[PDB]
Homo-oligomer: A and B are copies of this chain.
């Protein structure tokens, strides 16, 4: 049947913790491999209340930057709150000052800079980020907060995702919502160039490369991530909409938060879009398919005349984020299950977009690749109806937080995807998926709740899966240490080692491994 969680240990993923004064030596069990010399940096919330006022949604709690360090054999753990404008004001004024995603702030309309979602490199720097216009620059070694950076000073966007794409030369691509800034209502592709010899901040030289068109102008789609290949940029327009009439109004005048501005569009489905990366030009192929929520691309790549697009989908048009309020996630296990019964259903899908479309094949399947069941029907009005190839589909068992051997196989033909397993939204197990043969591997322990797994290649790696997978696990229960870092081999998802700590660690969303 299932894997259950009567103990309710997952509630401690959403419990406030305190930062550290300096790094804490972690109790290693097993052999930490000697080639693993770097620093696992991850972001997540760590303050779910300010005094009596609580934060209501998963994505409201004040951002906390975590660092697991690896050197020779040893491991250390450190964490500091990011001194954001939201945090410092909250801490000094002793209440929720800045309005978060799901937690409106009472006075005793400023955009939150609460960078709890991810962290990525720009030039010599590293910015923690949420999905707004404010990215916060942080010190990766000391976890100190350096400066708040406003993208509105450099590019014409209202926000940007927490999932930008980093090319090997350090060039950063990202996608952002634009709500009429510079008279344009669209989705824009920001390009931050790599650091030059003159050492000028890349951000200062950032630019918009290409503009994806909006299906409904007054209701743009929510965008969490996008696809990138050597030649093409994929953007997936979902039916989760942001109602601008509500989003661009005096929020305090009706006690609104960002969530109150969302709507699902029942008739649209999902529109898929393509842009030539190099020519910087939007391609006008009308790719259409049935409705789903989309948050994370697994990977994207060119294969003969086709773009292979692998998505972690949630079936249906209800905003999945409705089921991610902290009230719900801290309920007991039979209620967590009961709540997600009517939720969108998670499925890994491969979508295959044909890049050139012959008029003579109208009414026919264009997807002539030999190794897929994915379909693309050219219609008379020139829409191209796609059906997926399902890669993984389990009942309320979501392969989410996808991760791959990014540096070497990102944007390119690949075979393996590592992921976090959401069991009715409680993170629960770590997964590996072979996208060619649909085969899987699972790591799992009772009352142990892991985070996104990050891949870290062997220096002499020949295979795609020659490396290890790092995960932050929260293991409550008497006797056992409250949390640990988990080092899994990427071949078996077999355990290599554990760095255990004395203190709780809450949920963490995304991160990176910084080599040295």
Contact = CB atoms under 8 A, between A and B. Distances in A.
Contacts of A380: 266
Contact of A316 (B291, B375, B381, B390): B375
The SS class assigned to the A binding surface is loop
Interface stretch (A153-161, A180-188, A341-349): A341-349
A387 B315 contact: yes
Contacts of A385: 290-291, 316
Contact of A375 (B315, B387, B394): B315
A363 B315 contact: no
Interface string A369-380: 011111101011
A486 interface: no
Nearest to A338: B368
B290 A365 contact: no
Contacts of A408: none
Interface string A260-300: 00001010000000000000000000000111000000000
Contacts of A395: 370-373
A317 B380 CA distance: 12
A316 B373 contact: no
A89 interface: no
Contacts of A375: 315-316, 344-345
A398 to B, nearest CB: 10
Given A370-B395, A387-B316, A365 B377 contact: no
Contact of A343 (B264, B316, B365, B387): B365
Nearest to A368: B341
Contacts of A444: none
A291 B384 CA distance: 13
Interface string A311-350: 0000111100000000000000000000001111111000
Nearest to A388: B390
Contacts of A1: 370
Nearest to A289: B290
A300 to B, nearest CB: 20
A393 interface: yes
Contact of A365 (B315, B363, B381): B315
A432 to B, nearest CB: 19
A187 to B, nearest CB: 24
9 contacts: A315-B375, A316-B365, A316-B377, A343-B364, A345-B373, A345-B387, A346-B373, A372-B395, A373-B393
Interface of A: 1, 264, 266, 289-291, 315-318, 341-347, 361, 363-368, 370-375, 377, 379-381, 385, 387, 389-390, 393-395
Given A345-B367, A345-B374, A345-B375, 17 more contacts: A264-B363, A266-B380, A289-B290, A316-B365, A318-B363, A342-B361, A342-B365, A342-B366, A344-B365, A344-B375, A345-B365, A371-B395, A372-B395, A373-B393, A373-B395, A389-B393, A390-B390
